[PDB]
Design a binder for this molecule. Structure first.
Ligand code: HEM
Ligand code: HEM
Ligand code: HEM
Ligand code: HEM
Lengths: 140, 143, 140, 144
């Protein structure tokens, strides 16, 4: 349900992210775990300390899913179907946590793309991440 | 916050431009969460993103908001007392839903990130998340 | 999107409401205004006293919109397009308030349809009202 | 805080009504309507369907204890913070429950009271109970 303008802004911003997506995913996870420690309890088998290969690896996976979403904005439900089942049915992730990760991702993107992260682009990226979150919680 | 954490946030806050960051935060609130514009009818043209961000009343009001945050930063052990007057204004007079206090705090954090980049570390950001949650809770108290 | 089972539950529940829809709309508004007094600030032009003509009339309008939604569950965005522009662009209703009205509606329906308001029906009606709310806030 | 007239109204209503199945119904409906909440109740066994949830003996037993806690709150409306301090620690530090869920359960409880008690659960009385459940949720969230 992203507008044409929002889709344009998301594609352009994610293009600017380019090859740094995995790095930014890892940083977003780190920021989420430090700012919102309750989120750590979804990852009891992880070392969540700074520089952990598990945080690095998971951040890469999250970023890859976001890249897939950016390439399929017209059909996020289909593209993210497997991930929706995992997060909602298997893991039972509380919807509030999607807002925490989304905020963490916006902080990360603003930090690294200060010239690109205009108010309009911020608004578009916020809607994008909310849309992705809605799909991943769609079983609810 | 611990004493050592308070010292860390105080040193970082020293660097923040009081003339600019507040205006940017309020402007982004109005653009990203457009229902918040309901409370600022008297501020004139908020009809586009560029109008919001270039509106002198938004910039002026944002400076006052950041001044309030700066005051909060000097009274971290008694945010409730510090924000009592503003709580009355926002809750009893303006009827702002308290969820919006959290939104503005988070927008401020995004603005600090945009303006300070790598210096706004995950550790420092986590400290500021505690501060803005504290401010939001203090503003909401009169509910 | 509502599941087929959810749509079944919503249509059957609204059938049981039948001729009482306008009455229940007015009651839900009253419950919203009393329980959540901040919502009253959207209606400064109303007499908000119990049984006021404006609350009765507005309750009937809300009920009519919900009836239209129940008859167009496959395309709520189209059916409620005018209402979306009104609530998001003109009235700038804070999204929190949709949850308050939705809760008020569930309380009203549970009160009047205690034998019919099963846990499964409750879940379906909750999703329905959330979906209507999402459409009316879709500009955000 | 409730006014004197409001406190009297909630006290009189709570006195007369049979509530020994209300807590079980409220918890069951929480688990059905908001399925992520099932994450916290893995040890309760079968929650795989609505009928399984609502007929689960551990759900019913736990719901009764939860409403007992609410009833204790109703007797200490002047100090909900003190009443729920220990439970706040448990729910935050040990159980990792996001405080948004306290508001959800309170609202489910109100829906359950409406379902069970008909015309006597008036808009005025319900508004009084909304103050109570908001008070309880705020007290449970305090330690977060
Ligand atoms: C934009 C939102 C999100 C995206 C795109 C996303 C993406 C992913 C991806 C791609 C995987 C790996 C799938 C696989 O290997 O099969 C995954 C797993 C996981 N996600 Fe998310 N996720 C999101 C939000 C969240 C949130 C909010 C939480 C919890 C706070 C969370 C917790 C998990 C957990 C616990 C796993 C499994 C990790 C493991 O044990 O290996 N996710 N996520
Ligand atoms: C951390 C959050 C916030 C802080 C610290 C804050 C601070 C302030 C301050 C310092 C004033 C000036 C009051 C005076 O001069 O007497 C003010 C006014 C105001 N605030 Fe906020 N505020 C916050 C959040 C919000 C939010 C979220 C909204 C609306 C969505 C809002 C709407 C207003 C309005 C409408 C005024 C009056 C403007 C006028 O007409 O002059 N505030 N706020
Ligand atoms: C399920 C959610 C809702 C539905 C179905 C709904 C439906 C309606 C309808 C049918 C109208 C009249 C439109 C017309 O005359 O052309 C309306 C107007 C309005 N609604 Fe809503 N509404 C909803 C939620 C809300 C909420 C949450 C608020 C505020 C708390 C709100 C505030 C208003 C206001 C202020 C008006 C204008 C009243 C007037 O012109 O006198 N609505 N709504
Ligand atoms: C007003 C809201 C709530 C009250 C008054 C409340 C009260 C309680 C009480 C009294 C107990 C201990 C019962 C005993 O003696 O064994 C308890 C345990 C628990 N509560 Fe809550 N609670 C509330 C909300 C919630 C919510 C929203 C969740 C999760 C979504 C939750 C999850 C739990 C869990 C997991 C336990 C431990 C169950 C076990 O023994 O395995 N509570 N709660």
């Amino acid at each position: 349900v992203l507008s044409a303008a929002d889709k344009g802004n998301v594609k352009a911003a994610w293009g600017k992210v380019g090859g740094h997506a995995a790095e930014y995913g890892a940083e977003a996870l780190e920021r989420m775990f430090l700012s919102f420690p309750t989120t750590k309890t979804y990852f009891p088998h992880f070392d969540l300390s700074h520089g952990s290969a598990q945080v690095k690896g998971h951040g890469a996976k999250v970023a890859a899913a976001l890249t897939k979403a950016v390439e399929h904005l017209d059909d996020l439900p289909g593209a993210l179907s497997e991930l929706s089942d995992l997060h909602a049915h298997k893991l039972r992730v509380d919807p509030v946590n999607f807002k925490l990760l989304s905020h963490s991702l916006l902080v990360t993107l603003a930090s690294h793309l200060p010239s690109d992260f205009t108010p309009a682009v911020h608004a578009s990226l916020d809607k994008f991440l909310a849309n992705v979150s809605t799909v991943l919680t769609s079983k609810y | 916050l611990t004493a050592e954490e308070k010292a860390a946030v105080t040193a970082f806050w020293g660097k923040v431009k009081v003339d600019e960051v507040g205006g940017e935060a309020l402007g982004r609130l109005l653009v990203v969460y457009p229902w918040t514009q309901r409370f600022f009818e008297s501020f004139g043209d908020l009809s586009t993103a560029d109008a919001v961000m270039n509106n002198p009343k938004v910039k002026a009001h944002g400076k006052k908001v950041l001044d309030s945050f700066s005051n909060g930063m000097k009274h971290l052990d008694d945010l409730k007392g510090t924000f009592a007057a503003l709580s009355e204004l926002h809750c009893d007079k303006l009827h702002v839903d308290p969820e919006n206090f959290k939104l503005l705090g988070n927008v401020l954090v995004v603005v600090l990130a945009r303006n300070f980049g790598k210096e706004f570390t995950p550790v420092l950001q986590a400290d500021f998340q505690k501060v803005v949650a504290g401010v939001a809770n203090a503003l909401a108290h009169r509910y």
